[PDB]
Amino acid sequence: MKVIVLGSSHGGYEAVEELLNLHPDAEIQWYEKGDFISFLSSGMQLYLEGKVKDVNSVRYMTGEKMESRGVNVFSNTEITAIQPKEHQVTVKDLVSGEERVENYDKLIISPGAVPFELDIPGKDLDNIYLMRGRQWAIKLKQKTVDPEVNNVVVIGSGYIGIEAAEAFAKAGKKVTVIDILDRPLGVYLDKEFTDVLTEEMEANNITIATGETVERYEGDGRVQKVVTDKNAYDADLVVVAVGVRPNTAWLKGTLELHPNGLIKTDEYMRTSEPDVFAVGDATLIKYNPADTEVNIALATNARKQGRFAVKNLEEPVKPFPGVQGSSGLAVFDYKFASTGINEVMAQKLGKETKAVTVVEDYLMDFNPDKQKAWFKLVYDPETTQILGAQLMSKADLTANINAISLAIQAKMTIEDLAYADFFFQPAFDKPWNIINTAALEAVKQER
Ligand SMILES: Cc1cc2nc3c(=O)[nH]c(=O)nc-3n(C[C@H](O)[C@H](O)[C@H](O)COP(=O)(O)OP(=O)(O)OC[C@H]3O[C@@H](n4cnc5c(N)ncnc54)[C@H](O)[C@@H]3O)c2cc1C
């Protein structure tokens, strides 16, 4: 049984791991069009801030290690087309230009996504950079110490844009973040959280320009200005972090795709064609808070889907359990985490919700280490089932969001969480901990 896996990033990598422990006998080929196997773009911020010195260590697998396990690794080799009925792919060795056709019994593809670019005048003056992969990581890092870079503009105020803004602010640059949306990180956090984070970023000389549409880049050879409908900003470097496009144009006509380019798959990771499975950023995933399919481009999702594709390789026997969209990040001193439905998600899905927010010290009064914490619990108005939660503090309390992720999956209610058994010891929390306290508030709001 010969299985070909496309892609060495999170989705493709975990498919290879699950093949090794479920089908040790199989002939496994692993293809990567790039030069470097399994670079962790999630670790790029630690490298840009100087926490990690060696860019080549920001990875989780090497071709050498997988070959020791009997996998055939082909780096610098691109799968150019799939011929699904005859079960063949044509591959191109990018160093020699050779093209050959390869047959498979089963094919798992995790083609991923590419950074979205602004197709505007000035489009590629020098020093308009993107943020994905090893080559961009290295170029961004060289700019961090360049004395000619004084002003950097990042377009996009989502997760990746704020990571870039923090990294260049810490390198001593002046940073402006521009976006059409009215709040940074709105996809992850509601207004009472992003108001605090905006103040924190502005204290560290990041200007946030919201509600503005970028119209063109101006400069002579290299960028010098970014002009929006409302303003013109000086820029020595631009980081475009607007979003991501599925890497699927080459699949048009071969596999069924959604209007937005995402690959259609069912709950067993099967595509429209026999024996080809698709995983990761290029697909939709079962979203349990709202019982629907949503594109949630996270490494956690791609890894779980990669293993479930291998579980359903011979028979559709194991439907995907679904996810809650859990995410977490530190922005200067604040560490936040969120899961499930928040205001932007509810708007997009047309879902009605209720919520309580508690802001108080997470340790008892007499303990001098006490610090404020913000917690918001979102629940269904009819059933009072838990639909989401967001938490933030300068203290690290983020592991508590893992309990809310499970509560949503288990369809627990505000009353279940109000009296759930969480430990107490006064160096760590209060007799009713942060989750108990917000659920107790919600029980009062519904009485
Ligand atoms: C800056 C940054 C920070 C992030 N931080 C986090 C985080 O902290 N936590 C988290 O959960 N997620 C994070 N993510 C998201 C996460 O990295 C992605 O969700 C995940 O990498 C998706 O994996 P994938 O396999 O679907 O695709 P991709 O990572 O896009 O990889 C696809 C791979 O397949 C290769 N390929 C594509 N086409 C072909 C082909 N035709 N032939 C051969 N090879 C091909 C590509 O070269 C690429 O290596 C972050 C992403 C970025 C960019």
Coordinates of C-alpha atoms and ligand atoms in Angstrom, one line a residue:
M1 CA 0.0 0.0 0.0
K2 CA 1.8 3.1 -1.2
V3 CA 0.6 6.4 0.3
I4 CA 1.8 9.8 -0.9
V5 CA 1.5 12.7 1.5
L6 CA 1.8 16.3 0.1
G7 CA 3.3 18.9 2.5
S8 CA 5.8 18.8 5.3
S9 CA 3.9 21.3 7.6
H10 CA 1.4 20.4 10.4
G11 CA -1.2 18.6 8.4
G12 CA 1.2 16.5 6.2
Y13 CA 3.5 15.8 9.1
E14 CA 0.9 14.3 11.4
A15 CA -0.5 12.2 8.6
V16 CA 3.0 10.6 8.2
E17 CA 3.2 10.0 12.0
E18 CA -0.2 8.3 12.1
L19 CA 0.7 6.2 9.0
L20 CA 3.9 5.1 10.8
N21 CA 2.0 3.8 13.8
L22 CA -1.1 2.4 12.0
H23 CA 0.4 1.2 8.7
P24 CA 4.1 0.5 9.5
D25 CA 4.2 -1.8 6.4
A26 CA 3.2 1.0 4.0
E27 CA 5.5 2.5 1.4
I28 CA 5.2 6.3 2.3
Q29 CA 6.4 9.1 0.2
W30 CA 6.4 12.6 1.7
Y31 CA 6.8 15.6 -0.8
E32 CA 7.8 19.2 -0.1
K33 CA 8.3 21.8 -2.8
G34 CA 10.4 23.9 -0.5
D35 CA 14.0 23.5 0.6
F36 CA 13.3 23.1 4.3
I37 CA 11.3 20.4 6.0
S38 CA 8.8 21.4 8.8
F39 CA 9.8 25.0 9.6
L40 CA 7.6 26.2 12.5
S41 CA 6.2 29.6 11.4
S42 CA 4.3 29.7 14.8
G43 CA 7.8 30.2 16.4
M44 CA 8.8 33.1 14.2
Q45 CA 8.0 35.8 16.8
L46 CA 10.3 34.1 19.4
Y47 CA 13.1 34.2 16.8
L48 CA 12.4 37.9 15.8
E49 CA 12.5 38.9 19.4
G50 CA 15.8 37.2 19.9
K51 CA 14.6 34.5 22.3
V52 CA 15.7 31.9 19.8
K53 CA 19.0 32.7 18.0
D54 CA 19.2 30.0 15.4
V55 CA 16.5 30.1 12.7
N56 CA 17.2 26.5 11.6
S57 CA 16.2 25.1 15.0
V58 CA 12.7 26.5 14.8
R59 CA 11.3 23.3 13.5
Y60 CA 9.9 20.0 14.6
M61 CA 11.2 17.4 12.1
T62 CA 14.0 16.9 9.6
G63 CA 14.1 14.8 6.4
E64 CA 17.0 12.8 7.8
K65 CA 15.1 11.7 10.9
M66 CA 12.1 10.6 8.8
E67 CA 14.3 8.7 6.4
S68 CA 15.7 6.8 9.4
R69 CA 12.1 5.6 10.0
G70 CA 11.7 4.3 6.4
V71 CA 9.9 7.3 4.9
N72 CA 10.9 8.5 1.4
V73 CA 11.3 12.3 1.7
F74 CA 11.4 14.4 -1.4
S75 CA 12.3 18.0 -0.7
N76 CA 12.5 20.6 -3.6
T77 CA 9.9 18.5 -5.4
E78 CA 6.5 19.8 -6.3
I79 CA 3.3 17.9 -7.0
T80 CA 2.2 19.6 -10.1
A81 CA -1.1 17.8 -10.8
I82 CA -3.3 15.0 -9.6
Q83 CA -4.9 12.5 -12.0
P84 CA -7.5 11.1 -9.5
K85 CA -9.1 8.3 -11.6
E86 CA -5.9 6.5 -12.6
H87 CA -4.4 7.3 -9.2
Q88 CA -1.3 9.1 -10.4
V89 CA 0.3 12.5 -9.6
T90 CA 2.9 14.3 -11.7
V91 CA 5.8 15.5 -9.8
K92 CA 8.6 18.0 -10.7
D93 CA 12.0 18.0 -9.2
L94 CA 12.7 21.7 -8.9
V95 CA 16.5 21.5 -8.9
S96 CA 16.8 19.3 -12.1
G97 CA 13.6 20.3 -13.9
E98 CA 12.7 16.6 -14.4
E99 CA 9.0 15.6 -14.4
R100 CA 7.8 12.1 -13.7
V101 CA 4.4 10.5 -13.0
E102 CA 4.1 8.6 -9.7
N103 CA 1.2 6.1 -8.8
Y104 CA -0.4 5.8 -5.4
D105 CA -3.0 3.7 -3.6
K106 CA -4.0 6.6 -1.2
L107 CA -3.1 10.3 -1.4
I108 CA -3.4 12.8 1.5
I109 CA -2.8 16.5 0.6
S110 CA -2.2 19.3 3.0
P111 CA -1.4 22.2 0.5
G112 CA -2.0 25.0 3.0
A113 CA -2.3 28.7 2.3
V114 CA -0.3 31.6 0.9
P115 CA -0.2 35.2 2.3
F116 CA -2.8 37.5 0.8
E117 CA -1.3 40.5 -1.0
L118 CA -2.8 43.9 -1.7
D119 CA -3.1 44.3 -5.5
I120 CA -2.7 48.1 -5.5
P121 CA -0.4 50.7 -7.2
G122 CA 3.1 50.4 -5.7
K123 CA 2.4 46.6 -5.2
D124 CA 6.0 45.7 -5.2
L125 CA 8.3 48.5 -4.5
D126 CA 11.1 47.1 -2.4
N127 CA 10.5 46.5 1.4
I128 CA 7.0 45.3 1.3
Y129 CA 7.3 42.0 3.2
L130 CA 5.1 39.0 4.0
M131 CA 5.2 36.8 7.1
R132 CA 5.1 33.1 6.5
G133 CA 8.0 30.5 6.3
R134 CA 11.7 30.5 6.7
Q135 CA 12.8 32.9 3.9
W136 CA 10.5 35.7 5.2
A137 CA 11.5 35.0 8.8
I138 CA 15.2 35.7 7.9
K139 CA 14.5 38.9 5.8
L140 CA 12.2 40.3 8.6
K141 CA 15.0 39.6 11.2
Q142 CA 17.6 41.5 9.1
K143 CA 15.3 44.5 9.1
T144 CA 15.0 44.4 12.8
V145 CA 18.6 45.7 13.1
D146 CA 18.7 47.9 10.0
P147 CA 19.5 51.5 11.0
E148 CA 17.7 52.8 7.9
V149 CA 14.4 51.3 9.1
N150 CA 12.8 53.9 11.4
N151 CA 9.0 53.6 10.6
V152 CA 7.3 50.3 9.9
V153 CA 3.7 50.0 8.9
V154 CA 1.9 46.6 9.2
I155 CA -1.4 46.2 7.4
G156 CA -3.7 43.8 9.3
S157 CA -4.5 43.9 13.0
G158 CA -5.1 40.2 13.5
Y159 CA -2.9 37.6 15.3
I160 CA 0.0 37.7 12.8
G161 CA -0.1 41.5 12.4
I162 CA 0.1 42.1 16.2
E163 CA 3.0 39.6 16.5
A164 CA 4.9 41.6 13.8
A165 CA 4.0 45.0 15.5
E166 CA 5.3 43.8 18.9
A167 CA 8.5 42.4 17.4
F168 CA 9.4 45.6 15.6
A169 CA 8.3 47.9 18.6
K170 CA 10.7 45.8 20.8
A171 CA 13.5 46.3 18.3
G172 CA 13.1 50.1 18.8
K173 CA 11.1 51.0 15.7
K174 CA 8.1 53.3 15.3
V175 CA 5.1 51.1 14.3
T176 CA 1.7 52.0 12.8
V177 CA -0.9 49.2 12.4
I178 CA -3.6 49.9 9.8
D179 CA -6.8 48.0 9.2
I180 CA -10.4 48.4 7.9
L181 CA -11.8 46.7 11.0
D182 CA -12.5 48.9 14.0
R183 CA -10.7 46.9 16.8
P184 CA -7.4 45.0 16.7
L185 CA -7.8 41.2 17.4
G186 CA -11.6 41.4 17.1
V187 CA -11.8 37.9 15.7
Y188 CA -10.4 36.6 19.0
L189 CA -11.5 39.0 21.6
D190 CA -14.4 41.3 22.5
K191 CA -14.2 45.1 23.1
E192 CA -13.6 45.1 26.8
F193 CA -10.4 43.1 26.2
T194 CA -9.2 44.9 23.0
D195 CA -9.7 48.3 24.7
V196 CA -7.1 47.3 27.4
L197 CA -4.7 45.9 24.8
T198 CA -4.9 49.0 22.6
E199 CA -3.8 51.1 25.5
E200 CA -0.9 48.7 26.2
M201 CA 0.3 48.8 22.6
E202 CA 0.0 52.6 22.4
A203 CA 2.2 52.8 25.6
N204 CA 4.8 51.0 23.6
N205 CA 4.7 53.3 20.6
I206 CA 2.5 51.4 18.3
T207 CA -0.2 53.7 16.7
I208 CA -3.3 51.8 15.7
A209 CA -5.1 53.4 12.7
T210 CA -8.5 51.7 12.4
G211 CA -11.3 52.0 9.8
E212 CA -8.9 52.9 6.9
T213 CA -8.6 51.4 3.5
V214 CA -5.1 51.3 2.0
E215 CA -5.1 52.7 -1.5
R216 CA -1.5 52.7 -2.8
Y217 CA 2.1 52.5 -1.8
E218 CA 4.3 55.4 -2.9
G219 CA 8.0 55.5 -3.2
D220 CA 11.0 55.6 -5.5
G221 CA 12.3 52.0 -6.1
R222 CA 11.4 51.1 -2.5
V223 CA 8.4 52.0 -0.3
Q224 CA 8.4 55.4 1.3
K225 CA 4.6 56.1 2.0
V226 CA 1.4 54.1 2.5
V227 CA -1.6 56.2 1.7
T228 CA -5.1 55.2 2.8
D229 CA -8.4 56.9 2.0
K230 CA -7.9 59.1 5.1
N231 CA -4.2 59.5 5.6
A232 CA -0.6 59.0 4.4
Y233 CA 2.0 57.2 6.6
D234 CA 5.7 57.2 6.3
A235 CA 7.1 53.8 5.9
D236 CA 10.6 52.3 5.5
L237 CA 9.2 48.8 5.7
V238 CA 5.6 47.4 5.3
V239 CA 4.6 44.0 6.6
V240 CA 1.3 42.8 4.9
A241 CA -0.6 40.6 7.3
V242 CA -4.1 40.9 5.9
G243 CA -5.0 37.2 5.7
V244 CA -4.3 34.0 3.8
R245 CA -5.5 32.5 0.4
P246 CA -5.9 28.6 0.0
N247 CA -3.1 27.1 -2.2
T248 CA -5.7 25.4 -4.4
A249 CA -5.8 27.1 -7.9
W250 CA -3.9 24.2 -9.3
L251 CA -6.7 21.8 -8.1
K252 CA -9.5 23.7 -10.1
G253 CA -11.1 21.1 -12.3
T254 CA -9.6 18.2 -10.4
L255 CA -11.3 18.3 -7.0
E256 CA -14.5 20.0 -5.9
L257 CA -13.7 23.4 -4.3
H258 CA -15.9 25.9 -2.5
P259 CA -16.4 29.4 -4.2
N260 CA -13.7 30.8 -1.9
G261 CA -11.1 28.2 -3.0
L262 CA -11.3 25.8 0.0
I263 CA -11.3 22.1 -0.7
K264 CA -14.7 20.3 -0.1
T265 CA -14.2 17.4 2.4
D266 CA -16.6 15.4 4.5
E267 CA -16.2 14.4 8.2
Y268 CA -13.8 11.6 7.3
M269 CA -11.5 14.1 5.4
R270 CA -12.4 12.6 2.0
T271 CA -12.5 14.9 -1.0
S272 CA -14.9 14.5 -4.0
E273 CA -12.6 11.9 -5.5
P274 CA -11.9 8.3 -4.4
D275 CA -8.8 7.7 -2.3
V276 CA -7.7 11.4 -2.0
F277 CA -8.0 13.1 1.4
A278 CA -7.4 16.8 2.2
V279 CA -6.4 18.4 5.5
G280 CA -5.3 21.7 7.1
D281 CA -5.7 25.4 6.3
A282 CA -7.1 24.6 2.8
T283 CA -10.2 23.0 4.3
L284 CA -13.3 23.7 6.6
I285 CA -13.5 22.0 10.0
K286 CA -16.5 21.0 12.2
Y287 CA -17.0 23.8 14.7
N288 CA -18.9 22.5 17.7
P289 CA -20.1 25.8 19.4
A290 CA -22.4 26.4 16.4
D291 CA -22.7 22.9 14.8
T292 CA -21.4 24.1 11.5
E293 CA -18.3 23.9 9.3
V294 CA -15.9 27.0 9.5
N295 CA -12.4 27.6 8.2
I296 CA -10.2 28.0 11.3
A297 CA -6.6 28.1 10.2
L298 CA -4.7 26.8 13.2
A299 CA -1.9 24.3 13.6
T300 CA -3.9 22.3 16.2
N301 CA -6.6 21.8 13.7
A302 CA -4.3 20.7 10.9
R303 CA -2.6 18.1 13.2
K304 CA -5.8 16.5 14.3
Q305 CA -7.3 16.4 10.8
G306 CA -4.0 14.8 9.5
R307 CA -4.4 11.9 11.9
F308 CA -8.1 11.4 11.2
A309 CA -7.4 11.2 7.5
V310 CA -5.2 8.2 8.2
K311 CA -7.8 6.7 10.5
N312 CA -10.3 6.7 7.6
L313 CA -7.9 5.6 5.0
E314 CA -9.5 2.3 4.2
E315 CA -13.0 2.8 5.5
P316 CA -15.1 5.8 6.7
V317 CA -15.1 4.6 10.3
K318 CA -14.2 7.5 12.6
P319 CA -16.0 10.9 12.1
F320 CA -14.1 14.0 13.2
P321 CA -15.1 15.1 16.8
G322 CA -15.0 18.9 16.0
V323 CA -13.2 21.8 17.5
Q324 CA -13.9 25.0 19.5
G325 CA -11.4 27.4 17.9
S326 CA -9.2 27.8 21.0
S327 CA -6.3 30.3 20.7
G328 CA -3.9 32.1 23.0
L329 CA -1.1 34.7 22.8
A330 CA 0.9 37.2 24.9
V331 CA 0.8 40.9 23.9
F332 CA 3.5 42.7 25.8
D333 CA 2.6 42.0 29.5
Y334 CA -0.9 40.6 28.9
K335 CA -1.5 36.9 28.2
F336 CA -4.9 36.0 26.8
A337 CA -6.8 32.9 25.6
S338 CA -10.2 32.4 24.0
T339 CA -12.4 29.7 22.7
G340 CA -15.8 29.3 21.2
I341 CA -18.2 32.1 20.1
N342 CA -17.4 35.8 20.7
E343 CA -19.1 38.9 19.2
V344 CA -17.6 38.8 15.7
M345 CA -18.3 35.0 15.4
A346 CA -21.9 35.4 16.6
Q347 CA -22.5 38.2 14.0
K348 CA -21.0 36.1 11.2
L349 CA -23.1 33.0 12.2
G350 CA -26.3 34.9 13.0
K351 CA -26.3 33.4 16.5
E352 CA -27.9 35.1 19.6
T353 CA -25.8 35.0 22.8
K354 CA -25.7 36.3 26.4
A355 CA -22.5 37.0 28.4
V356 CA -21.2 38.1 31.8
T357 CA -17.7 39.7 32.2
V358 CA -16.0 39.7 35.7
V359 CA -12.9 41.8 36.3
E360 CA -11.2 41.3 39.7
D361 CA -8.1 40.2 41.5
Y362 CA -7.6 36.5 41.0
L363 CA -6.0 36.0 44.5
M364 CA -7.5 36.9 47.8
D365 CA -7.2 40.3 49.3
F366 CA -4.4 39.6 51.8
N367 CA -2.1 38.0 49.2
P368 CA 0.4 40.7 47.9
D369 CA 0.9 38.8 44.6
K370 CA -2.7 39.5 43.6
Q371 CA -3.3 40.9 40.0
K372 CA -6.5 41.7 38.1
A373 CA -8.0 39.3 35.6
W374 CA -10.7 39.7 33.0
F375 CA -13.0 36.7 32.3
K376 CA -16.0 36.7 29.9
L377 CA -18.4 33.8 29.7
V378 CA -20.7 33.5 26.7
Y379 CA -23.7 31.2 26.8
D380 CA -26.9 30.3 25.0
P381 CA -29.9 32.4 26.2
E382 CA -32.4 29.5 25.9
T383 CA -30.5 26.4 27.1
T384 CA -27.8 28.3 29.1
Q385 CA -25.2 26.0 27.5
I386 CA -21.7 27.3 27.4
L387 CA -20.8 28.8 24.0
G388 CA -17.4 30.5 24.6
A389 CA -15.1 32.3 27.0
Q390 CA -12.2 34.8 26.9
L391 CA -9.7 35.5 29.6
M392 CA -6.8 37.9 30.1
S393 CA -4.3 38.9 32.8
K394 CA -0.7 39.8 33.3
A395 CA -0.5 36.6 35.3
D396 CA -0.6 33.4 33.2
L397 CA -4.1 31.9 33.8
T398 CA -4.5 30.7 30.1
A399 CA -4.6 26.9 30.9
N400 CA -8.1 27.6 32.4
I401 CA -9.4 28.1 28.8
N402 CA -8.8 24.3 28.2
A403 CA -11.5 23.5 30.8
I404 CA -14.0 25.8 28.9
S405 CA -13.1 24.1 25.5
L406 CA -14.2 20.8 27.1
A407 CA -17.3 22.3 28.7
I408 CA -18.5 23.5 25.3
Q409 CA -17.9 20.1 23.7
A410 CA -19.7 18.4 26.6
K411 CA -22.7 20.8 26.3
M412 CA -22.4 21.8 29.9
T413 CA -24.4 24.8 31.3
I414 CA -23.7 27.8 33.5
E415 CA -25.0 25.9 36.5
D416 CA -22.6 23.0 35.9
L417 CA -19.7 25.4 35.9
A418 CA -20.9 27.5 38.8
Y419 CA -20.5 24.4 41.1
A420 CA -17.8 22.5 39.3
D421 CA -15.0 21.2 41.5
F422 CA -11.9 23.3 40.9
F423 CA -9.1 23.1 43.6
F424 CA -8.4 26.0 46.0
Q425 CA -5.1 26.9 47.6
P426 CA -4.5 30.6 48.3
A427 CA -1.2 30.9 46.5
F428 CA -3.0 29.9 43.3
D429 CA -6.6 31.2 43.3
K430 CA -9.7 32.1 45.4
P431 CA -12.2 29.5 46.9
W432 CA -14.5 30.0 43.9
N433 CA -12.0 30.2 41.0
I434 CA -12.2 32.5 37.9
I435 CA -14.5 30.0 36.1
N436 CA -16.8 29.4 39.1
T437 CA -17.1 33.2 39.8
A438 CA -18.2 34.2 36.2
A439 CA -20.7 31.2 36.1
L440 CA -22.1 32.2 39.5
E441 CA -22.7 35.7 38.1
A442 CA -24.5 34.2 35.1
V443 CA -26.7 32.1 37.4
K444 CA -27.7 35.3 39.2
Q445 CA -28.4 37.0 35.8
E446 CA -30.8 34.2 34.9
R447 CA -32.7 33.9 38.2
Ligands
LIG1 C1 3.3 33.8 11.6 C2 2.4 32.6 11.9 C3 2.1 32.3 13.2 C4 1.2 31.3 13.5 N1 1.0 30.9 14.9 C5 0.2 29.9 15.2 C6 0.1 29.6 16.6 O1 0.8 30.1 17.4 N2 -0.7 28.5 16.9 C7 -1.4 27.8 16.0 O2 -2.2 26.9 16.3 N3 -1.3 28.2 14.7 C8 -0.5 29.2 14.3 N4 -0.3 29.5 12.9 C9 -1.1 28.8 11.9 C10 -0.5 27.5 11.4 O3 0.9 27.8 11.2 C11 -1.2 26.9 10.2 O4 -2.5 26.7 10.6 C12 -0.6 25.5 9.8 O5 0.8 25.7 9.4 C13 -1.3 24.9 8.6 O6 -0.7 23.7 8.2 P1 -1.0 23.1 6.7 O7 -0.2 21.9 6.6 O8 -2.4 23.2 6.5 O9 -0.3 24.2 5.7 P2 1.0 25.2 5.5 O10 1.6 25.4 6.8 O11 0.5 26.3 4.6 O12 2.0 24.2 4.7 C14 1.8 23.7 3.4 C15 3.1 23.1 3.0 O13 2.9 22.2 1.8 C16 3.9 22.7 0.8 N5 3.2 22.5 -0.5 C17 2.2 23.2 -1.0 N6 1.9 22.9 -2.2 C18 2.7 21.9 -2.5 C19 2.9 21.1 -3.6 N7 2.1 21.3 -4.6 N8 3.8 20.1 -3.7 C20 4.6 19.9 -2.6 N9 4.6 20.7 -1.6 C21 3.6 21.7 -1.5 C22 4.2 24.1 1.1 O14 5.5 24.4 0.7 C23 4.1 24.1 2.7 O15 5.4 23.7 3.2 C24 0.6 30.5 12.6 C25 0.9 30.9 11.2 C26 1.7 31.9 10.9 C27 2.1 32.2 9.4

